[PDB]
Amino acid sequence: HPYYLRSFLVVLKTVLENEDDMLLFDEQEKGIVTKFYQLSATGQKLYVRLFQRKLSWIKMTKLEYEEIALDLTPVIEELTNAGFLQTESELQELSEVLELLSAPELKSLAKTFHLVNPNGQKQQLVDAFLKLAKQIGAVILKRAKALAGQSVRICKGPRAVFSRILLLFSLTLVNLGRMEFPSYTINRKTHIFQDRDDLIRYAAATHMLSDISSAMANGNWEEAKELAQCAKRDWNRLKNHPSLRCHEDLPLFLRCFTVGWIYTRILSRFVEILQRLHMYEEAVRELESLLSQRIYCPDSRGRWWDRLALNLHQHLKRLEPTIKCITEGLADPEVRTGHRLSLYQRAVRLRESPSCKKFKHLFQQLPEMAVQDVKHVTITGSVEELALAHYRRSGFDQGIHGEGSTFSTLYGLLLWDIIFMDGIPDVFRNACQAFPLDLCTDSFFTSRRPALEARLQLIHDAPEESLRAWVAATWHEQEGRVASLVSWDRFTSLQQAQDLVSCLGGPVLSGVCRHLAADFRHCRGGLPDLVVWNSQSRHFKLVEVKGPNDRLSHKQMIWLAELQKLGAEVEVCHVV
DNA sequence: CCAGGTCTCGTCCGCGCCACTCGTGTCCAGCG
DNA sequence: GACACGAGTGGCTT
DNA sequence: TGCGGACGAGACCTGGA
């Protein structure tokens, strides 16, 4: 079987094997799945290939895939009987015929009925024939279909079922069959989706969010704004619908996969575009409304407070609301790492600024958390490779451009037993899960608290050999197994990881792992990019490399201060 | 004492799967 | 009529 | 969300006065 068919079959079997997931699908949808199974291998390959393509008609001349078959003409018939593909006979909607027609063939069609400018843009000509059809339409359609040829569209019905299956799988695509996943007991005690309609709703919400992200990428913002507006209108409805209340009681990691969560991320994208369209007052209204709920996306409350403060300060030029927003944001426990530092820095800059005296300062009430200053080194001399070269010139001999993946890899290696341990409900729902589902959530440290603290303390008091024994044992058992935390390409060899942990030492590594385990989402970003060590000296310098243009991020400063606190010498290498 | 150039911090913005084949918009030199 | 560039979408991606 | 590029606004001095 080819790669795409293997991946699709893996997804299909994964969704089949979970009984709760198939509780969602109706009888005819399971019939469609079985119909897919009772097809030729060539037919399955063809349908997967068309599934990767967009839901538009494809000219039969363009469709040919030599590997699936020398000739696709029968396979098309086979899929046609089952209801998977609709051949030319169903092409009764004229707009898609025009889109199917090639532009030179558009010119030919305009010649056939030259009631309109012969030449021009494809969109313009298509609008022209569409107007012409409205004002003879049967003959126009007949000639259009005749000149187009034979085309096959992936039927909406079956494609919807396979799309929901893919959504369920990726919820928890080229190398899917080849990559093997780690060993862990599959245990789901709650249902991410309660009813089939709920998955339909989740599919609709994710489709809307994907449309808004496509508008993000294309740079089109007005359509993005109206899409976000209708999304907000939709989420204004269905709020009273009992489905949401059941979804609230869900754990945070499982609540991530809910209609409300996707609509809240859509609202966040609306905040981003509103700032992009410079409708800053509306962005402030949305951000204040976003923080009015504690239920959905508590993880992103930091960006909401930071953006609210920045909007009220430098883009609405109001100080009194800014003081309140900074104080409230620092008061919310959910803010971590960079955003807390950003709000603090805003508060301190306002404190030692003119025109802030007018009101009671309220920063006397505000806590004073100060990032420890880190040593800054500037070398003159691909900037990160240059920094590696400069440190190689120093006493240090080796180093790895971790970019935060090195600490994630070490943490995953040294805590793999706890990361994938059993006895935790719903944190592994499918046989295909690269990472435990409760990771990137505060529930990770709480649920695993005894063993997590035990292993973290052990690493804290671990001799270098014990860390090396643990890293060696875990790597041998799990090399290759998929894991979001562990990047196997990140370390050249297991000996490299052994040398790294031993050089880093048990305490500072234990602290880094503790921070990554308490809240991985906020602590993962901002780690120093470059870690350098000398094998003989066993001395390490963790270096965050920032070019002349870019300055230290708030997360980077927080992590550098924390790493210096743990006993690591950290400097920021500027290469000018 | 006043500058006008410079700095530096704060902020916005584009992308956030990649080169790759192929249908397209336009114009551009001739063409009548 | 060609047209020759770029751009863009779409497809494929072990 | 994390980058790496941009912009500009207030400081700010010092050359010149």
Q: Which residues of A134-150 are buried (b: 16+ CB within 10 A; e: fewer)?
A: eeeeeebbeebbebbeb
In angstroms, rounded to a whole number, what is the distance separating the alpha carbons of residues A259 and A514? 32
Distance A16 CA to C11 C1' (A): 29
Distance A73 CA to D12 C1' (A): 77
| CB within 8 Å of A379: residues ≥ 6 apart | A386, A387, A390, A573, A574, A575
| Strand B lies under 7 A from the Cβ of residue A58 | no
| CB within 8 Å of A395: residues ≥ 6 apart | A534, A537, A539
Q: Which nucleotide is nearest to A547 (CA to C1')?
A: D4
Q: Is the alpha carbon torsion for A61, A63, A67, A73 positive or negative?
A: negative
Distance A556 CA to B8 C1' (A): 19
3-state secondary structure of A145: helix
| Strand B lies under 7 A from the Cβ of residue A312 | no
* A171 in Cβ contact with A257 (< 8 Å): yes
Side-chain half-sphere exposure of A364, counting CA atoms within 13 A:
5
| CB within 8 Å of A242: residues ≥ 6 apart | none
| CB within 7 A of strand B (chain A, 107-136) | 119-123
In angstroms, rounded to a whole number, what is the distance separating the alpha carbons of residues A80 and A437? 40
Q: Which nucleotide is nearest to A336 (CA to C1')?
A: D1
Q: Which domains does chain A have, with CATH numbers?
A: 1-87+151-178 (1.10.10), 98-149 (no CATH), 184-351 (1.25.40.10), 375-575 (no CATH)
Of residues A244, A243, A340, A260, the one with CA closest to residue A297: A260
Question: Judging by DSSP bridges, how do beta strands A375-379 and A539-545 pair with one another?
Answer: unpaired
Distance A384 CA to D14 C1' (A): 37
Nucleotides of D under 7 A from a protein CB: 1-6, 11
| Strand B lies under 7 A from the Cβ of residue A106 | yes
In angstroms, rounded to a whole number, what is the distance separating the alpha carbons of residues A308 and A283? 8
What DSSP designation does A89 have?
G
Distance A314 CA to B14 C1' (A): 22
Is A545 marked as binding a ligand?
Answer: yes
Residue nearest to nucleotide D4 (CA to C1'): A550
3-state secondary structure of A458: helix
In angstroms, rounded to a whole number, what is the distance separating the alpha carbons of residues A235 and A246? 16
| Strand D lies under 7 A from the Cβ of residue A547 | yes
- CA dist A474 → A83, A454, A507, A526 (Å): 49, 17, 20, 26
In angstroms, rounded to a whole number, what is the distance separating the alpha carbons of residues A334 and A330? 9
* A165 in Cβ contact with A14 (< 8 Å): no
The first and second tokens of residue A238, run together, are: 């269905």
Q: Which residues of A200-220 are buried (b: 16+ CB within 10 A; e: fewer)?
A: ebbbebbebbebbeebeeeee
Distance A508 CA to D17 C1' (A): 60
In angstroms, rounded to a whole number, what is the distance separating the alpha carbons of residues A326 and A347? 7
Residue nearest to nucleotide B22 (CA to C1'): A62
Q: Which nucleotide is nearest to A48 (CA to C1')?
A: C12
3-state secondary structure of A151: strand
Strand arrangement, sheet containing A151-154: A58-59, A151-154, A85-86
Question: Distance from first CA to last CA of chain A, Å, rounded?
Answer: 52
| Strand D lies under 7 A from the Cβ of residue A556 | yes
Of residues A304, A306, A200, A194, the one with CA closest to residue A255: A194
CA angle A518, A521, A524 (to 5 degrees): 90
Residue A375: Cβ within 10 Å count? 11
| Strand B lies under 7 A from the Cβ of residue A300 | no
In angstroms, rounded to a whole number, what is the distance separating the alpha carbons of residues A329 and A309? 9
CA angle A74, A78, A83 (to 5 degrees): 140
Give the resolution to one decimal, in Å: 3.2
**DSSP line for A7-68:** HHHHHHHHHHH-HHHHHHS-HHHHHHHHHHHTS-HHHHHHHHHHHHS-SS-EETTT---TTT
Nucleotides of C under 7 A from a protein CB: 9-14
The first and second tokens of residue A266, run together, are: 């859509």
* A59 in Cβ contact with A128 (< 8 Å): no
Long-range contact set of residues A222-230: C-beta below 8 Å, sequence gap at least 24: A222/A277, A224/A269, A224/A273, A225/A270, A225/A273, A225/A274, A225/A277, A228/A266, A228/A267, A228/A269, A228/A270, A228/A273, A229/A270
The number of residues in chain A equals 576
Q: Which nucleotide is nearest to A105 (CA to C1')?
A: B23
Is A529 marked as binding a ligand?
Answer: yes
Q: Is the alpha carbon torsion for A332, A337, A338, A344 positive or negative?
A: positive
Experimental method: cryo-EM
Distance A538 CA to C13 C1' (A): 43
Nucleotides of B under 7 A from a protein CB: 9-17, 23-26
| CB within 8 Å of A320: residues ≥ 6 apart | A359
What DSSP designation does A372 have?
P
Residue nearest to nucleotide D9 (CA to C1'): A314
| CB within 7 A of strand B (chain A, 345-384) | 345-346, 349
Residue nearest to nucleotide C8 (CA to C1'): A218
Distance A548 CA to D6 C1' (A): 13
Distance A386 CA to D12 C1' (A): 34
**Beta strands of A66-199 (E only): which ranges?**
85-86, 151-154
